[PDB]
Amino acid sequence: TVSLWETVQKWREYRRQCQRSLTEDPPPATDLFCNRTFDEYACWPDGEPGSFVNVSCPWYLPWASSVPQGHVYRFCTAEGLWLQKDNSSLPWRDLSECEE
């Protein structure tokens, strides 16, 4: 099976690549975009207002080859703010395609 330490190593490389992307990717066409971020699980780019933002299932997942075409989703509202889950401070997120 896939070990914890191999998954941790892959996660650190994913985080490191994401932080390079966050710092170096050119800015969006307007601050009306939702802002790029790393939520500890996936790397989110800038989001167009009023549309869904999809990112490939994180490639460090132990079962990554079980979901090679899956996507995790956020929604960027018309206000340029990530859609939030009520009863929490966290943005709404659909990861169902990246489950085991």
Binding site: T1, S3, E6, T7, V8, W11, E40, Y41, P62, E100
Partner: peptide, 26 residues
């Protein structure tokens, strides 16, 4: 899932999965 090595392999696989679940809720 009948032999000792099935349990030990399951235990090792769970360590990685709990780490994912920590990232998710985190």
């Amino acid at each position: 899932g009948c032999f000792t090595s099935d349990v030990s392999s399951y235990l090792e696989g769970q360590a990685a999965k709990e780490f994912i679940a920590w990232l998710v809720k985190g």
